[PDB]
Amino acid sequence: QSYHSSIFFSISKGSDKIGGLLEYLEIIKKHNINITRIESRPSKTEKKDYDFFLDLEYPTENNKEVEKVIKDLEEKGVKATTLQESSNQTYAPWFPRKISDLDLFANKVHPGASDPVYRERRREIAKIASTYKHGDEIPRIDYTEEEIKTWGVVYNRLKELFPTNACHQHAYIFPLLEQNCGYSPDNIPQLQDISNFLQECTGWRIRPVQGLLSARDFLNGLAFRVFHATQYIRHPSVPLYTPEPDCCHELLGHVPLLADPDFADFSQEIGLASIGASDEDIQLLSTCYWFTVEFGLCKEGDTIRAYGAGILSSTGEMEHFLTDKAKKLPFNPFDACNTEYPITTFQPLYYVAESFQKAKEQMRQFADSFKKPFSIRYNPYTQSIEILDNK
Amino acid sequence: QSYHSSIFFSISKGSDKIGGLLEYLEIIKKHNINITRIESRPSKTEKKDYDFFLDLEYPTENNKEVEKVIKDLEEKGVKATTLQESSNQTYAPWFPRKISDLDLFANKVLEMGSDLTSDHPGASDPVYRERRREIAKIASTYKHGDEIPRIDYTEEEIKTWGVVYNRLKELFPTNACHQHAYIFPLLEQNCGYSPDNIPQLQDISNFLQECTGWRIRPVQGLLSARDFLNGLAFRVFHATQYIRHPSVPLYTPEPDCCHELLGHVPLLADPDFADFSQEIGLASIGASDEDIQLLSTCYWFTVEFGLCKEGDTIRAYGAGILSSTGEMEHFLTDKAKKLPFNPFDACNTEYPITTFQPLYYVAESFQKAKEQMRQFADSFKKPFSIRYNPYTQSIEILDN
Ligand SMILES: O=S(=O)(O)CCN1CCN(CCS(=O)(=O)O)CC1
Ligand SMILES: O=S(=O)(O)CCN1CCN(CCS(=O)(=O)O)CC1
Ligand SMILES: C[C@H](O)[C@H](O)C1=Nc2c(nc(N)[nH]c2=O)NC1
Ligand SMILES: C[C@H](O)[C@H](O)C1=Nc2c(nc(N)[nH]c2=O)NC1
Ligand SMILES: [Fe+3]
Ligand SMILES: [Fe+3]
């Protein structure tokens, strides 16, 4: 368990301070093992400045060595803005800056808990997410006959319901998943194939995840158009329901919508908003996420359909949302963000999105007043987060 | 040796032709010896349509087998468009569709690889030839997605680099366009630029990706003009990993690593130049052979030997100038003519490859050059227009 800090500052080409600044940066890079990375880049704002980035990694929270580094740094003539992973508000929240920085989350994480066999199996699959690095191929799972049997039952069951209950984007993409990603009742699709297909449709990627991440970590991954997905399958004893995300939920629920460009933008938008957001704002985003990506409905003419991954992968949920006892409301993040919700029962309340581009715009407007030290932007050419000093 | 063909077509969701079409595709997938890939994707132009892409390779040119595929396919009720690598003009020119399809180029060299000319100073150096073989092999086996292998350069290799580096370094502040001076300290700080060290392509590629989305691929040697320029459409620069022979440090006709790293890389980290360079790439996608040649000439007179104007002064941004002491010391003098860059003018202009330029073109800015190149590209006869998708890193075809 480690605590990350990042220090930002800018300086102009031809500055009198650069010489000593650079020299200082060399000494700490060599003789301070808490420093993991120091880099400089062209400024996104002042076309004549350089942006600098100093990444530190400590074993304990609010390590005061950071202040020591800040002081020695600002002594060379620059003003430093420091972000940190912490419960305190001494510094604004840290965020992963590159898609490869999501590697830092890899080790940050019941019907069959009363089953040792199933428990050892879960342990083995989770090992793979634990060791996976950005850039690697996603290792393929040799699923057992039992596991494949469970997939088949869920698959065939949900397949009977999609055409009448799923939003049209889902019906649109599913045959492409069949034709390109090996979707079938007889075969559990591998994440590496799904990730390649998603990349080529909307730039989204998958990485395996051990289990539940914190809301901040998971949402931050979305900012890079990276979806964290489990590889294990639910226990065979209870096939038609599970309280947790298993591969059926990931692959039949989340993945198809990620191949729709407008949905893909919307999801990333939620991710961007989370980058560097305060804990209270993360919680608002997480709830918005629940009522859209997880349990959202779309409007299609005089009809209401499901796009939420938690609905699409649950026969009981799909056979519930259309009943009159379940309340429906137009999606509005100001209304949804504060709404309580059950995790162990069907939803009593669903929010209806008009269109994904509208949901994207609504979220962006919602997030616009989030307090953050930097303006966060995504650059599709560099595939990275741009950080602007305009606040 | 092989010739690529691409067949594509669309079909609407819910078409009753889909079942039979998929059945037909399964058949040729197993039984057609020349089929290399069949893929279906969401349409990027019609929200209710699917795009299908069939890729094929044939050992001979104008292979009449492709027509049978087109006939069979269109019997299933779709209208196919075919692109083909050929000196014939039956079909429009093939181009790589996805960034990873540049792997198809890995062995398409040509000259300045491990097959050297007899006047090459290292042609009868057996150590050097083995070294060029080794380094070429690395490019040969490199696949999109790999980290670029790091070369353990020898002390004689590092010595040659240092001679060139030190000689060039003195001239940069006075002779290079300001984008160079801006970026170079970052190359020193982030990519290991110094005279004691040859920078590794993987480090440069990471740096360029974060600056402008450009990346590096190691290349054996000279690619055909079409292949090289097509690579640019993806913001992919093919760069060599070998260094020139130690006997003649201040000159080489080949694009060795001193040329790539000291001439080409600094400008690619500038957003406007990087967009300009991609625009040239995009112009080449599906361009006729004749237009590829025109683009090549535009490239020569800009990316390789272009000048910028800064107030009353002329400076160099062309990689062939920045990496050559001789050339740097030539362009500023009145011994060479200077003209305003204009692709409609410059594209017909002749030029020597084995002497300094008698004529250089000045670009007002990389934004104007880009816009000029887009006008140029539009003047081509292309059967469709293309656009680049940075999210999918793919060329998208649009109807004309
Ligand atoms: O899904 S795909 O990867 O194919 C294209 C995603 N891309 C994201 C950016 N938006 C417009 C930004 S905005 O300025 O309109 O907000 C266009 C669609
Ligand atoms: O290099 S950077 O990543 O910093 C900015 C590059 N980016 C390339 C795309 N153009 C608009 C596309 S076009 O439709 O105007 O050609 C804006 C600038
Ligand atoms: C943030 C989001 O609303 C929700 O709280 C979370 N979802 C997930 C998560 N982690 C994983 N692996 N998968 C999720 O779906 N962390 C939390
Ligand atoms: C297109 C450009 O003008 C020139 O013809 C080419 N240059 C290069 C090439 N191939 C490589 N590898 N590097 C170049 O610089 N082939 C074509
Ligand atoms: Fe989920
Ligand atoms: Fe060159």
Side-chain angles (χ1 to χ4, degrees), chain B residues 304-318:
Chain B
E304 216 78 66
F305 293 93
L307 307 180
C308 68
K309 183 147 204 184
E310 292 173 358
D312 258 333
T313 69
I314 287 152
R315 302 281 172 90
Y317 70 90

PDB file of all heavy atoms in Angstrom, chain B residues 304-318:
ATOM      1  N   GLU B 304      11.949  17.640 -45.756  1.00  0.00           N
ATOM      2  CA  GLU B 304      13.377  17.344 -45.873  1.00  0.00           C
ATOM      3  C   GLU B 304      14.256  18.599 -46.009  1.00  0.00           C
ATOM      4  O   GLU B 304      15.283  18.709 -45.337  1.00  0.00           O
ATOM      5  CB  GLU B 304      13.638  16.406 -47.054  1.00  0.00           C
ATOM      6  CG  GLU B 304      14.764  15.404 -46.789  1.00  0.00           C
ATOM      7  CD  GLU B 304      14.322  14.235 -45.917  1.00  0.00           C
ATOM      8  OE1 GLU B 304      13.475  13.443 -46.359  1.00  0.00           O
ATOM      9  OE2 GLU B 304      14.826  14.086 -44.791  1.00  0.00           O
ATOM     10  N   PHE B 305      13.864  19.545 -46.858  1.00  0.00           N
ATOM     11  CA  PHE B 305      14.728  20.705 -47.124  1.00  0.00           C
ATOM     12  C   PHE B 305      14.017  22.057 -47.087  1.00  0.00           C
ATOM     13  O   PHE B 305      14.413  23.003 -47.789  1.00  0.00           O
ATOM     14  CB  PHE B 305      15.426  20.545 -48.477  1.00  0.00           C
ATOM     15  CG  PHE B 305      16.407  19.421 -48.512  1.00  0.00           C
ATOM     16  CD1 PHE B 305      16.022  18.167 -48.935  1.00  0.00           C
ATOM     17  CD2 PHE B 305      17.715  19.614 -48.105  1.00  0.00           C
ATOM     18  CE1 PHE B 305      16.932  17.119 -48.958  1.00  0.00           C
ATOM     19  CE2 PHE B 305      18.621  18.570 -48.127  1.00  0.00           C
ATOM     20  CZ  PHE B 305      18.227  17.323 -48.554  1.00  0.00           C
ATOM     21  N   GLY B 306      12.992  22.159 -46.252  1.00  0.00           N
ATOM     22  CA  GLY B 306      12.246  23.392 -46.157  1.00  0.00           C
ATOM     23  C   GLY B 306      12.890  24.445 -45.280  1.00  0.00           C
ATOM     24  O   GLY B 306      13.640  24.143 -44.339  1.00  0.00           O
ATOM     25  N   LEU B 307      12.568  25.691 -45.596  1.00  0.00           N
ATOM     26  CA  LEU B 307      12.986  26.829 -44.801  1.00  0.00           C
ATOM     27  C   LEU B 307      11.764  27.544 -44.250  1.00  0.00           C
ATOM     28  O   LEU B 307      10.662  27.429 -44.788  1.00  0.00           O
ATOM     29  CB  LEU B 307      13.823  27.800 -45.633  1.00  0.00           C
ATOM     30  CG  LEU B 307      15.030  27.228 -46.384  1.00  0.00           C
ATOM     31  CD1 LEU B 307      15.738  28.327 -47.158  1.00  0.00           C
ATOM     32  CD2 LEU B 307      15.990  26.499 -45.444  1.00  0.00           C
ATOM     33  N   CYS B 308      11.970  28.283 -43.172  1.00  0.00           N
ATOM     34  CA  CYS B 308      10.933  29.141 -42.616  1.00  0.00           C
ATOM     35  C   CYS B 308      11.417  30.587 -42.739  1.00  0.00           C
ATOM     36  O   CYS B 308      12.606  30.828 -42.927  1.00  0.00           O
ATOM     37  CB  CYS B 308      10.650  28.774 -41.155  1.00  0.00           C
ATOM     38  SG  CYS B 308      12.062  29.155 -40.020  1.00  0.00           S
ATOM     39  N   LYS B 309      10.512  31.554 -42.658  1.00  0.00           N
ATOM     40  CA  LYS B 309      10.950  32.940 -42.558  1.00  0.00           C
ATOM     41  C   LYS B 309      10.628  33.473 -41.167  1.00  0.00           C
ATOM     42  O   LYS B 309       9.536  33.247 -40.642  1.00  0.00           O
ATOM     43  CB  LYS B 309      10.309  33.825 -43.634  1.00  0.00           C
ATOM     44  CG  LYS B 309      10.811  35.278 -43.579  1.00  0.00           C
ATOM     45  CD  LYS B 309      10.891  35.953 -44.951  1.00  0.00           C
ATOM     46  CE  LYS B 309      11.900  37.105 -44.930  1.00  0.00           C
ATOM     47  NZ  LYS B 309      11.967  37.875 -46.210  1.00  0.00           N
ATOM     48  N   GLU B 310      11.599  34.153 -40.566  1.00  0.00           N
ATOM     49  CA  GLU B 310      11.405  34.759 -39.258  1.00  0.00           C
ATOM     50  C   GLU B 310      11.826  36.204 -39.336  1.00  0.00           C
ATOM     51  O   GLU B 310      13.012  36.523 -39.218  1.00  0.00           O
ATOM     52  CB  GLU B 310      12.186  34.002 -38.185  1.00  0.00           C
ATOM     53  CG  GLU B 310      11.624  32.597 -37.926  1.00  0.00           C
ATOM     54  CD  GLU B 310      12.494  31.772 -36.992  1.00  0.00           C
ATOM     55  OE1 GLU B 310      13.559  32.282 -36.582  1.00  0.00           O
ATOM     56  OE2 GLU B 310      12.116  30.616 -36.676  1.00  0.00           O
ATOM     57  N   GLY B 311      10.854  37.081 -39.570  1.00  0.00           N
ATOM     58  CA  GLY B 311      11.141  38.494 -39.740  1.00  0.00           C
ATOM     59  C   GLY B 311      11.926  38.745 -41.017  1.00  0.00           C
ATOM     60  O   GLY B 311      11.459  38.443 -42.113  1.00  0.00           O
ATOM     61  N   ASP B 312      13.129  39.285 -40.889  1.00  0.00           N
ATOM     62  CA  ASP B 312      13.963  39.507 -42.059  1.00  0.00           C
ATOM     63  C   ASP B 312      14.881  38.332 -42.347  1.00  0.00           C
ATOM     64  O   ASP B 312      15.686  38.380 -43.276  1.00  0.00           O
ATOM     65  CB  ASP B 312      14.795  40.775 -41.890  1.00  0.00           C
ATOM     66  CG  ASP B 312      14.227  41.940 -42.661  1.00  0.00           C
ATOM     67  OD1 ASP B 312      13.546  41.688 -43.679  1.00  0.00           O
ATOM     68  OD2 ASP B 312      14.459  43.098 -42.254  1.00  0.00           O
ATOM     69  N   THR B 313      14.755  37.271 -41.556  1.00  0.00           N
ATOM     70  CA  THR B 313      15.709  36.177 -41.635  1.00  0.00           C
ATOM     71  C   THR B 313      15.085  34.861 -42.100  1.00  0.00           C
ATOM     72  O   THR B 313      13.896  34.593 -41.900  1.00  0.00           O
ATOM     73  CB  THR B 313      16.407  35.957 -40.272  1.00  0.00           C
ATOM     74  OG1 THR B 313      15.472  35.430 -39.320  1.00  0.00           O
ATOM     75  CG2 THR B 313      16.979  37.275 -39.756  1.00  0.00           C
ATOM     76  N   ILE B 314      15.919  34.051 -42.740  1.00  0.00           N
ATOM     77  CA  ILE B 314      15.548  32.719 -43.163  1.00  0.00           C
ATOM     78  C   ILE B 314      16.223  31.713 -42.242  1.00  0.00           C
ATOM     79  O   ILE B 314      17.396  31.864 -41.919  1.00  0.00           O
ATOM     80  CB  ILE B 314      15.961  32.476 -44.617  1.00  0.00           C
ATOM     81  CG1 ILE B 314      15.041  33.251 -45.556  1.00  0.00           C
ATOM     82  CG2 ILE B 314      15.923  31.007 -44.948  1.00  0.00           C
ATOM     83  CD1 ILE B 314      15.704  33.624 -46.871  1.00  0.00           C
ATOM     84  N   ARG B 315      15.474  30.707 -41.801  1.00  0.00           N
ATOM     85  CA  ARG B 315      16.039  29.618 -41.014  1.00  0.00           C
ATOM     86  C   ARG B 315      15.574  28.279 -41.567  1.00  0.00           C
ATOM     87  O   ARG B 315      14.666  28.218 -42.401  1.00  0.00           O
ATOM     88  CB  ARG B 315      15.659  29.749 -39.541  1.00  0.00           C
ATOM     89  CG  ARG B 315      16.094  31.071 -38.884  1.00  0.00           C
ATOM     90  CD  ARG B 315      17.558  31.107 -38.504  1.00  0.00           C
ATOM     91  NE  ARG B 315      17.961  32.446 -38.064  1.00  0.00           N
ATOM     92  CZ  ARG B 315      17.906  32.896 -36.807  1.00  0.00           C
ATOM     93  NH1 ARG B 315      17.477  32.121 -35.816  1.00  0.00           N
ATOM     94  NH2 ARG B 315      18.295  34.134 -36.539  1.00  0.00           N
ATOM     95  N   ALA B 316      16.194  27.203 -41.098  1.00  0.00           N
ATOM     96  CA  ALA B 316      15.953  25.891 -41.676  1.00  0.00           C
ATOM     97  C   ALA B 316      15.121  25.009 -40.754  1.00  0.00           C
ATOM     98  O   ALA B 316      15.373  24.959 -39.557  1.00  0.00           O
ATOM     99  CB  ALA B 316      17.275  25.219 -42.000  1.00  0.00           C
ATOM    100  N   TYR B 317      14.115  24.325 -41.298  1.00  0.00           N
ATOM    101  CA  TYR B 317      13.421  23.316 -40.503  1.00  0.00           C
ATOM    102  C   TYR B 317      13.543  21.950 -41.159  1.00  0.00           C
ATOM    103  O   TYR B 317      13.261  20.927 -40.538  1.00  0.00           O
ATOM    104  CB  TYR B 317      11.948  23.682 -40.280  1.00  0.00           C
ATOM    105  CG  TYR B 317      11.062  23.605 -41.508  1.00  0.00           C
ATOM    106  CD1 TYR B 317      10.400  22.430 -41.839  1.00  0.00           C
ATOM    107  CD2 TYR B 317      10.874  24.714 -42.321  1.00  0.00           C
ATOM    108  CE1 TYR B 317       9.581  22.356 -42.952  1.00  0.00           C
ATOM    109  CE2 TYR B 317      10.058  24.648 -43.438  1.00  0.00           C
ATOM    110  CZ  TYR B 317       9.415  23.466 -43.744  1.00  0.00           C
ATOM    111  OH  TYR B 317       8.607  23.395 -44.847  1.00  0.00           O
ATOM    112  N   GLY B 318      13.986  21.934 -42.410  1.00  0.00           N
ATOM    113  CA  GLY B 318      14.126  20.684 -43.131  1.00  0.00           C
ATOM    114  C   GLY B 318      15.129  19.731 -42.501  1.00  0.00           C
ATOM    115  O   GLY B 318      16.255  20.112 -42.221  1.00  0.00           O
TER     116      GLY B 318
END
